[PDB]
């Protein structure tokens, strides 16, 4: 509803995050902020493949 | 009860009032006229940053020497509004009018170059396009500078790389006093939202 | 920068030029039930090289919380998740010439630990993580950045 | 209207709706002396409903 | 091959710069180009995000924190909490700011006033008449084992004040249960057993059409219409119950309030104040002007 | 690219403020606002009549 | 003087100017090739009618 | 749209593809507020695909 | 039979010359001719080829020679040729120009710098910005019993120079295979068995969309950072076999190599120079100025 | 919102009074009226014939 | 072509007949970069060739 802020508020009670080596457990979902309709605005991916 | 610290998500709103969107266009077609729903076209608008910037008569004059103040002040709307956002892009117009209040000579002239922004006149040279004009036929000098730039985005913070972006250089062949408006070309914007700073207020002395 | 400087990170970006890179954060929090507060995980571009009337510092409570964040209460949200989207005005982070930060992490108090007028126990601990996300490496270079 | 002038007037005139000589002393309703209520018919309120492309800045 | 004329004569105006000050028509500026036909792309991969920033609605819809009060088991019920935060328990209703703090320094004392706006009081500043729903978020930072009940009710008109030389403030002693009584004014009476939070929204309520965006900006005791004539009213936040705490935990509470607006209007590109808009930049130390 | 003129020479008259006596007309006044197509809403619900 | 130019500003009715900024959108003419200043005034008010 | 000028305004309006209040806190895609893409869109992007004389000084 | 008038009063501007520097509009200069709508006819039986020799395409692809090395027995593996030809072994990986000698005539001793541009370094001094493909022609003046490996890898990014008072050059030293291996760099390498010539193309890369055009114009130990700034990076040739060669041949075996771009884009129709664009008029005798 | 000019340079003539010794012609005469239509109507019922 | 202004260019535009990207290293014929043949695409030898009355001086 809000714009730029994240709002502390509750979530799922049991919340399970994999990040590629790491297995996060938290009580409830965490608040995230991420950026509204992100788009690359680089041009790596345009000069060689990784 | 349930031992907890929780948040339920309780709104409320105060009245039975009517849907805004009527009310708020109802006031505008009565008292207003116009709606503005976004902050660019303030940015196609012109508003002043200077109303009597003396120039040197034979000098080409970076407006950067202007701007860097202008900006910081925030007076006009592209500083005002430069202060909630971290990037720009696009170009930008400048209008000249003339306020010069004596006769230097028979043949007064207005003229205006492209320069690397955050370049000195002797680090430029005098060619690509210009604009020339006549204050006594034409006192108001209109200008628009292009975004030619290295970068597709450009920060209002300090960089390590110089001549990135173009900017403007103004010449006269007498001294000159001016009247100076700036805005944005059709295609100007700001980035990122970011915080608000403090604002400045009424001021006065107290000789306590 | 201060995640390419962690976890080993660096010796796989060496040999490398250029780097487009959306940063996560995370913060874990843990505070006994009797314990209260709030905090503020804001993220300023440029910060350290823009002026400094227009810094995250040197302004207002309402602006700094006008920028992009996150609040932290203790009992509701003992973790948060952020992503700060690549910052550079370039096509690409350079990692040999332009050592240089775009984005600074803050984090704010803004109300201080609420705890009993005991002690040792009335207190909050946090741990932060920090990874890489949306990444591109490109173009290989024999050159290295001495500040890893 | 027989004007000599390619433009008979300054201006496009605009109909108005009303069933009354004007000069007359009979009542006339203002309403229908022009049509501009809150709809597409104002310019920049159809501006605004018809999402332009100005209203943006672009 | 080589005939008359037979146009007329134009009248005409020698009116360079007609209509600079709007923001559509033609701009008679040239182009420092090679192409008359210069213009850049569209957005798509500028910025970091696809959406539009400079919409008022996203600007006006940032919230901010403006009030942080301490709510302490000492604090009287149907009394304003006033700990804390300057303008306590009271808010004033609108897009403008109400607060400022008086810098001074130095013969004589130069008095400059310093505003903290939210980005919707940053947008009313740059117009001369408002009008919006003001939205507001209020949320207690407490435990499980704190309760009480919150009252917060709206009360239209201007606000009573403590009019000082240089600012406004609320007057505590007209807003106890006694001389301020919420029985015929709209509210809501929160529980904090286990909920923290509750969204307000107040529409735009007022014998007028549109507000002032001048607020605080020059307000004291001789110049205080104004700022009464940019708000449509005033919160106040009372406790129904005392605050409840055992001493296993704080005596206090902290009430953080963030401010928005939506269904946002402005009137006039002009502002109302007495100067221009002006970014406060802080010195490198307290002696500097 | 950059062809030559065609048009003939306009004849024009210096006269500013011409017909500002009139009712009707197209009025060179400048607007002090952020729209040129400023206009209000027509008579409803302003007046007791 | 060698430049006469003319400047038109709004302002809010019955102020003063020591009472207003001399920002927001304005008109300009120079009375040697236009001697005449034609400036138009919206009704910018805070109600939909206005007192005699 | 009512106007008793025969240019109704300034320029000619630029459809959107916009489905909000434009004042309003929803969210708006700034793409779909202008069709500038790489394309005969863009004016001199559709002199060069286009092969027109002009490019080349005639 | 004599009307009256119905047009409203024009707004004008007396701004002669509006847009005269651009490429595109309607010109009013007035043509000392018969007809005004006098235009000459197509270009066909004019110039020896219908051809058009004005396209960038066609201009920056007249490939020109840049450097000749000299490839003696005695030089050691992975160490850049530098013998022969300035700028050695190295190639600054740009339209722009980087080499350039000083011309220093006498009191007092003026110094103009001159250039050896190509056609592609020509066009692009007329511009501030660039971005292209660049295109190398590396070939060997040898014999069929002169064998050799040549390793030609791609390093992005500044260049190592020993900086002048008045020029740059390369550090030879920093290109050695000790402290510039090639075994993270893009590369080719070439058997001289009985080949002699590799064509390398070098697309665009770097963090900008946009290159500067300025090279080595004004170039030294205190203005250095435009000319890095120049190029996206450089080729280094290095011999990863020794040159092997009897005594019945040359010692020696020369490479030449040209150079062109394409898919070639330029920016701004201005320079980024100190001064105007000049051309070097050689005097009749070391004297002159 | 703003674009940019795309007309050319208008070559004029400041010739006040051109072809006012003609009797066709569009007359610069700025009639002291209400409406700029002012016109008479015809001859029907002024003269005696 | 998305431009708010009616007269989206200084110039009418003409095409050339041209099969490659004009900054490519490809060769461009220039008889095609335009049509300016010994034809009546000749504004004077269509006059001509049409017997206009303006090159009899009517």
């Not at chain 5, 600079?20 to 192409?35: Q, W």
């Not at chain 5, 020059?218 to 001493?247: Q, V, Y």
């Amino acid at each position: 509803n809000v714009h730029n802020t994240k709002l502390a508020s509750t979530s799922a009670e049991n919340a399970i995050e994999k990040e590629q080596i790491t297995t996060f457990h938290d009580v409830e979902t965490p608040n995230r902020i991420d950026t509204p309709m992100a788009q690359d605005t680089s041009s790596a991916r345009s000069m060689d493949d990784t | 009860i349930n031992l907890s610290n929780k948040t339920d998500e309780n709104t409320i709103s105060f009245f039975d009032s009517g849907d805004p969107e009527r009310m708020n266009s109802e006031a505008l077609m009565r008292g207003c006229g116009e709606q503005i729903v976004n902050l660019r076209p303030l940015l196609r608008t012109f508003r002043t940053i200077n109303d009597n910037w003396s120039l040197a008569a034979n000098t080409k004059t970076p407006i950067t020497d202007l701007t860097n103040t202008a900006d910081a002040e925030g007076r006009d709307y592209m500083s005002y509004l430069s202060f909630l956002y971290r990037f720009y892009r696009g170009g930008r117009r400048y209008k000249f009018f003339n306020t010069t209040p004596l006769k230097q000579s028979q043949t007064c002239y207005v003229r205006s170059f492209l320069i690397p922004r955050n370049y000195t006149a002797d680090e430029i040279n005098t060619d690509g396009p210009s604009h020339i004009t006549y204050p006594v036929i034409n006192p108001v000098h209109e200008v628009e500078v292009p975004f030619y730039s290295q970068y597709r985005k450009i920060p209002i913070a300090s960089t390590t790389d110089k001549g990135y972006d173009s900017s403007l250089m103004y010449y006269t062949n007498v001294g000159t006093q001016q009247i100076v408006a700036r805005a944005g070309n059709d295609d100007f914007t700001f980035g990122w939202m970011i915080g608000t700073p403090q604002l400045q207020g009424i001021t006065k002395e107290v000789a306590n | 920068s201060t995640v390419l400087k962690a976890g080993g990170k660096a010796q796989k970006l060496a040999n490398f030029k250029y780097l487009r890179c959306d940063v996560q954060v995370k913060l874990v929090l843990n505070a006994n039930p009797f314990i209260a507060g709030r905090l503020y995980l804001a993220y300023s571009p440029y910060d350290d090289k823009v002026a400094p009337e227009r810094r995250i510092i040197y302004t207002s409570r309402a602006g700094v919380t006008g920028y992009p964040g996150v609040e932290l209460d203790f009992q509701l949200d003992n973790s948060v998740e952020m992503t700060i989207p690549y910052a550079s005005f370039q096509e690409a982070y350079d990692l040999v010439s332009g050592n240089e930060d775009f984005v600074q992490l803050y984090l704010f108090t803004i109300a201080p630990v609420l705890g009993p007028s005991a002690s040792a126990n009335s207190k909050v601990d946090l741990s932060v993580y920090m990874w890489l996300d949306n990444i591109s490496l490109v173009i290989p270079t024999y050159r290295l950045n001495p500040n890893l | 209207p027989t004007s000599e002038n390619p433009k008979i007037g300054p201006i496009s005139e605009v109909a108005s709706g009303v069933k009354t000589a004007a000069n007359g002393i009979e009542r006339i309703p203002v309403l229908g002396e022009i049509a501009k209520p809150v709809t597409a018919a104002v310019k920049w309120f159809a501006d605004i409903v018809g999402g332009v492309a100005a209203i943006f800045g672009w | 091959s080589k005939p008359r004329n037979q146009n007329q004569v134009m009248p005409l105006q020698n009116v360079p710069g007609w209509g600079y000050s709007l923001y559509k028509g033609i701009d008679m500026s040239v182009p420092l180009a090679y192409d008359p036909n210069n213009e850049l792309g569209d957005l798509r991969d500028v910025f970091p995000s696809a959406v539009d920033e400079m919409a008022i609605g996203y600007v006006c819809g940032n919230p901010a924190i403006k009030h942080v009060l301490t709510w302490s088991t000492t604090d009287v019920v149907q009394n304003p909490i006033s700990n804390g935060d300057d303008w306590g328990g009271v808010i004033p209703v609108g897009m403008p700011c109400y607060s400022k703090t008086i810098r001074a320094v130095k013969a004589t004392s130069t008095k400059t006033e310093v505003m903290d706006p939210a980005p919707c009081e940053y947008v009313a500043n740059l117009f001369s008449y408002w009008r919006a729903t003001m939205c507001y978020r209020i949320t207690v930072v407490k435990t499980a084992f704190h309760t009480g009940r919150l009252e917060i009710f709206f009360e239209p008109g201007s606000i009573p004040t403590v009019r000082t030389a240089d600012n406004l403030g609320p007057d505590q002693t007209q807003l106890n249960g006694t001389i301020a009584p919420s029985d015929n004014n709209y509210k809501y009476i929160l529980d904090l057993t286990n909920d923290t939070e509750v969204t307000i929204k107040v529409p735009y309520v007022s014998n007028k059409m549109f507000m002032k965006t001048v607020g605080i900006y020059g307000a004291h005791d001789e110049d205080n219409w104004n700022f009464d004539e940019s708000f449509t009213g005033f919160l106040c936040i009372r406790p129904i119950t005392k605050l409840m705490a055992p001493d296993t935990v704080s005596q206090k509470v902290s009430i953080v309030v963030w401010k928005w607006a939506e269904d946002v209007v402005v009137v006039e590109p002009k502002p109302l104040t007495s100067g221009p808009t002006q970014v406060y930049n802080p010195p490198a130390v307290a002696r500097d002007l």
